[PDB]
Amino acid sequence: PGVSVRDVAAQDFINAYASFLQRQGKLEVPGYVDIVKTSSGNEMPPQDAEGWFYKRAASVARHIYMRKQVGVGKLNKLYGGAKSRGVRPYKHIDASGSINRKVLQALEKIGIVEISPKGGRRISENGQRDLDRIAAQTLEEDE
Amino acid sequence: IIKIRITLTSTKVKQLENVSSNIVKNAEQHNLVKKGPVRLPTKVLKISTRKTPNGEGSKTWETYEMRIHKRYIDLEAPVQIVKRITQITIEPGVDVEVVVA
Amino acid sequence: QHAVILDQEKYDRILKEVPTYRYVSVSVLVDRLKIGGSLARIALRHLEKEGIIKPISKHSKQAIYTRAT
Amino acid sequence: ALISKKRKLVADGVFYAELNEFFTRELAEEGYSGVEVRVTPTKTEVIIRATRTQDV
Amino acid sequence: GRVRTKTVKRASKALIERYYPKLTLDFQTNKRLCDEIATIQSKRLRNKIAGYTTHLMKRIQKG
Amino acid sequence: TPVTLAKVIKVLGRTGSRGGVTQVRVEFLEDTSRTIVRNVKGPVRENDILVLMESEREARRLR
Amino acid sequence: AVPSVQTFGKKKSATAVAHVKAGKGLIKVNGSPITLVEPEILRFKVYEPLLLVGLDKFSNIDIRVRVTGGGHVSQVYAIRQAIAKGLVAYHQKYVDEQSKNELKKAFTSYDRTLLIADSRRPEPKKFGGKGARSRFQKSYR
Amino acid sequence: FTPVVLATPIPEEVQQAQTEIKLFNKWSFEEVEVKDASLVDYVQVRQPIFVAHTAGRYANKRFRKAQCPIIERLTNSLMMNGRNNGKKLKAVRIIKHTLDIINVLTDQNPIQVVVDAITNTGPREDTTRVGGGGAARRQAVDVSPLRRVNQAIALLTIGAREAAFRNIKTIAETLAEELINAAKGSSTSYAIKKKDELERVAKSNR
Amino acid sequence: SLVVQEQGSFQHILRLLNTNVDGNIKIVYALTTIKGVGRRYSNLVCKKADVDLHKRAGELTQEELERIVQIMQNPTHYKIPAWFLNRQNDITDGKDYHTLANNVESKLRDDLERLKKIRAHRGIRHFWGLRVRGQHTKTTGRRRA
Amino acid sequence: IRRAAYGVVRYVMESGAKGCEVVVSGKLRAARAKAMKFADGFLIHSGQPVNDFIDT
RNA sequence: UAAUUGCGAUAACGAACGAGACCUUAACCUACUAAAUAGUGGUGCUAGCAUUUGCUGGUUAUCCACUUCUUAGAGGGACUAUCGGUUUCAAGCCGAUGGAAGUUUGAGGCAAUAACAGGUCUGUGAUGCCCUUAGACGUUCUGGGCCGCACGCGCGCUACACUGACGGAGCCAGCGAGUCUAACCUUGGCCGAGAGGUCUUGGUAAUCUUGUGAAACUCCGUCGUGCUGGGGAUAGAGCAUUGUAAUUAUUGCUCUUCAACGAGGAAUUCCUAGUAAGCGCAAGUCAUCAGCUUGCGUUGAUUACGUCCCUGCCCUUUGUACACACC
Secondary structure: OOOOOOOOOHHHHHHHHHHHHHHHOOOOOOOOOOOOOOEOOOOOOOOOOOOHHHHHHHHHHHHHHOOOOEOOHHHHHHHOOOOOOOOOOOOOOOEOHHHHHHHHHHHHHHOOEEEOOOOOEEEOHHHHHHHHHHHHHHHHOOO | OEEEEEEEEEOOHHHHHHHHHHHHHHHHHHOOOOOOOEEOOOEOOEOOEEOOOOOOOOOOEEOOEOOEEEEEEEEEEOHHHHHHHHHOOOOOOEEEEEEOO | OOOOOOOOHHHHHHHHHOOOOOEEOHHHHHHHOOOOOHHHHHHHHHHHHOOOEEEEEEOOOOEEEEEOO | OOOOHHHHHHHHHHHHHHHHHHHHHHOOOOOEEEEEEEOOOOOOEEEEEEOOOOOO | OOOOOHHHHHHHHHHHHHOOOOOOOOHHHHHHHHHHHOOOOOHHHHHHHHHHHHHHHHHHOOO | OOOEEEEEEEEEEEEOOOOOEEEEEEEOOOOOOOEEEEEEOOOOOOOOEEEEOOOOOOOOOOO | OOOEEEEEEEEOOEEEEEEEEEOOOOOOEOOEOHHHOOOOOOHHHHHHHHHHHOOOOOOOEEEEEEEEOOOOHHHHHHHHHHHHHHHHHHHHHOOOHHHHHHHHHHHHOOOOOOOOOOOOOOOOOOOOOOOOOOOOOOOOO | OOOOOOOOOOOOOOHHHHOOOOOOOOOOOOOOOOOOOOOOOOOOOOOOOOOOOOOOOOOOOOHHHHHOOOHHHHHHHOOOOOOOOOOHHHHHHHHHHHHHHHHHHOOOOHHHHHHHHHHHHOOOEEEEEEOOOOOOEEEEEEOOHHHHHHHHHHHHHHHHHHHHOOOOOOHHHHHHHHHHHHHOOOOOOHHHHHHHHHHHHHHHHO | OOOOOOOOOOOOOEEEOOEEEOOOOEHHHHHHHOEOEOHHHHHHHHHHHOOOOOOEOOOOOHHHHHHHHHHHHOOOOOOOOHHHOOOOOOOOOOOOOOOOOOHHHHHHHHHHHHHHHOOOHHHHHHHHOOOOOOOOOOOOOOOOO | OHHHHHHHHHHHHHHOOOEEEEEEOOOOOOOOOOOEEEEEEOOOOOOOOOHHHOOO
16 A cells, blocks of 8 residues: 555554664674663663664664654754753753764665765665565554 | 845834835835735844842842844845835834845 | 562462462562562563463553453 | 844944933033934934034 | 723713714624724723623613 | 431521631421521532431531 | 645644545544554544544545644644544535534534634743742741 | 444544444443432533543633543542642553553443442541630531542542552552442541541541 | 573572672672672673673572673773773872772772872861862751761 | 922923923932922823823 | 722712723734745655555755745724623622633733832942042952851752653654854764764854754653662762863763662641643853753643631721830
8 A cells, every 4th residue: 555654653663673673684783882871861771782773773764764864963862861960950961972973874884874965864765665665564464 | 127135124113114115115116026025023132130239139020022023025126226215215213234136 | 578589389379379360460469479570570471471361451561461261 | 244133233222322321421511302313324313302402 | 800990981971972873782883883983092992982882772772 | 327318408608717618508308398507518509419427416607 | 626625723832734635534644644643542532533423524535734832742632623623624615514513513512622722821930939820938037 | 333444544443342332442431320319410420531631621610620520530639749740641541550450350330430439438527627716626517519529539549649659569559459449348448447537536526 | 481490500699709799689780789880880791791681690600700700800801991990090000990899998098098198188178077079068968977 | 499390390381291290309408318299280100101101 | 899990879079190991922813915034735856665546755946826824014803792690670790602712811011199217339430428549448460268167047959769760762842042353053074982072064043053853751661669770969080171270079971989868847838720730941140160040831730719717908987095106
């Protein structure tokens, strides 16, 4: 019938593409995956310390396919939460931009996204047909 | 005939729409496509301050809005019409600006 | 004052006494039998997987298991 | 120049304020009252309003 | 409360004094008639005056 | 204890010292000849149904 | 050709711009279907006109609704009364007063104000207090 | 029924189960009964809703508060103890869980369990500190029906929070146990305990 | 699921680094009873030892325990980056040192007496027993005990 | 004070305003300040009429 | 009656101020004016799926029209309309329908006569009088100080956890501000674990920052009731930025340290509906620094629609040996 990723739910499609890049096994993940907190709003590293990065790549894939183009300040201000910054009240917090940039390098070297005119990095043809096939998988798994 | 844009600002609404009425009058007169003039949302400069000298309890405050009105008109005219509607259509209290491209 | 590892004895006690109940959650499991909650959730995943009880209303904060029959 | 319209209109209000206190101290012996400002390109004007312009 | 004041009530009093062969039992007629016949400075006060005039004529038709 | 049903006849008015206890006359829902004054705690409308632990107190104005 | 209407739905500070055209029964919100709207509870609260009046009322019409402003709760309220009053204005313009009154009496015998945007807007913060009514603690000594 | 198919993929559990009979998400507000006829027309169980998260307008006159579908007032008193002011989506989630648990522990209609608990649990007298002059005399007083259902809702939720507070037995579980042991006159649920206490001090001070 | 019913491989409270450790809780929070390691450091050292964290601390025996303690007290030999440590540049030596159970408070006293025989302002306010960071004293920390 | 402000009020009243008042505050005759408030005609103090119908 | 607001009655009659009215701002408008400095519809061009005719998108303007939403000039709209009741048969209230709204529609601006020995001589080249005026009571500079610490008090933030913390993952606002003789806001590209630093753009602003992709929230889970992974002060070590200078940690980041507190007495503070209460943002401050205030949204209640018992306030009567007036 023709399926997009707006046709499929959030958390399901994200988990599906996370396990998709796990099954493909090529991501150029960093060698320090167990170290970075991904944000100073955090207080512990991502405690699913094996598929968090696959899942974050799935998140940025979904979030770019719903949107026009992004760089890194969008991603940091998005995924960063609110830090328990002490006896001082909370605020809004920038995240780890370096993991974000390494994600974007990964998605370009795969062929997910490209750096784009009018700035930013937009989703390309291989990434779009990829996400369409995988959203089709997630909506065809329903027996 | 030059793709010009007049832009007007003030803080007096009566006089502002008066200037706009006069410019729309001359634009209706000289029959240009004119892009019928545009209201912009006001810039409302608030300076909220203490109501006191010296510092003193019951710590009130007053507010002092000023409001700023901005408008623009988008025209196509030869140079004589341009300088005509520029320099015969002036009135105190309203700032005028012309941009050519 | 609870337990934190299996023994195969309380395992069989689960196997017998959870089908006696018709309402199952981690907190009522660790209030009746002696478990520290997390292992009760492991047990709820096992008793969902091998069908002994019935999830009706699963939520990440709260799962509601019941009698299969 | 190249000043945003917020700062420009605040500057014009300040300008009127400063002229008003200036003439208020200067021409107080004269019978001064106020200032109207005629902002025009090509030689703008200031309308001093007093009672004794024969001595102004 | 909805107690109107004398800068409404005397106005409507004199208005039914000097325009009885107009001013029926319809508010909208009365409001348009007030906007033509009267010298008013504000919409909200005019609405008040006409409402009270309407109420007065409504009491007049019963006695 | 044979609990007493009742039905509101009419309120009288909130009395008591702080004001927060109304007095209502109620009919016993089975004896239409017998209505009775009764102190009530919360908010009481008309014609609704009261419950009583006794029927023969009929307490008075409170100050 | 191509019958159409755009209507709105607002609540406290949310705007959904509803649009009903003739169609096939494709309902959506921002391209996503309305069965993906995730406050996770108010799925049925935004199905509420459809589960109320029936789905054969969606014979040959498709929907698009767009959201900006107004949180999560109030923006799905914008979605629901957008789609409600949009179907209402559709039954005003392209079919008759009979079926328009049937639907309007359905929504007002289930008057959850799907036919009036709810007109309680915030109050401004004032001095003395971190809110509109309240004040600070005063000490007195 | 022949449920309809269309260009939209909406499940038959959404439509055919709940079109033409608009129960609830499940477990109807239809075929419901109030036990005592003093909660008639103070407890609006006359009309079924779907979710208790309706933007209520009901405090804005005096007595329109009685016409909230009483799941709404239960989940509206569920938001207390300060840090849970204004967390209504979590409160309706807790209500859905505790009604499912009521359904498990008793095959009866959960809304019937709740409303019969309200009947069984509303305190029917009150004691009130009256001064007169002097040293704080007390007086018994009858109670309004609407004040009774007010007090009862507050009691059920209060007992639920204070029991499940430091305890691992979750809030839906403790609320459901409060509902069961409030429906029956158990005298093991807090609200039944406090109803006994207030009626007892009224019986003393009358 | 993941249920394991072994009786003898598990045992209760054990001892590491001159300190007894309750084995009835998981590892990365269990090691934090050692005064000197934290949640973050225990997390990273168990990740560098490659031990599954769905198990508690009573099991996962002696060879993996030596793996734990060696990777803990040799960070540069087990490629923990330097900034992660708890005594970074360490004036007297220059080399880095992740300090641990007793040495944290021993070197704490050592640095205190280091700059207090120097007679700097901080060591002076330490020996006077008052608040050291440049904060107000005149209201808080009263009845300091 | 009294003669001077009487002359002022008389002048503006005959000059055609509908209302005028002149407050002279401060130290008159003794070492304690006492105000004098000179008003003729009627004056309004309340809302937006004060702004667009009064100079001060 | 919100009211010296009115209906009335009357040795008073006409009035002025005050309330009101007026003004802002919030809401409603298929109604005019129009909007490449905002949207929308269609057309191209194009990505991808489905392929069936459909859908998801991009596409500064490829290009044509329109104003529903944003906007704001002009207005309209409410008067308590309609109806029942109630009342000397008035002013009014009470209920129901209608609608955008019926507490004065909300919320403010304004708010009198007379007063205070209330605050300010330290905002003022506003001023008097006393005082000093060249080794100054003027400036100006280098440090210190206001930041000291047995202790008493005021305001607040974080909390005492499972309605919770943590970790993923979803991801939704409004008010604003922002640089010409300056380095303002920063998108973006790179590097850094982070703070940040770089290469450079945009923007004098409805454009660029910005839909400020805010927090709370909510889903999938780790933890199990243990002062424990709550709470995060204390305290050491390092790393940066701002500044001529950072110790009396400026402040930010990374690790380690884990204290008191188990919802807190007598007392007592605030609140009647988008309200309290929770939740963050922007601004004033600013070379940096907000735990503060000024304002904005987000989520949004329970309970009374009362009374004069207490804290008091207005009017009349009565009483006084008070008039600085019950201190």
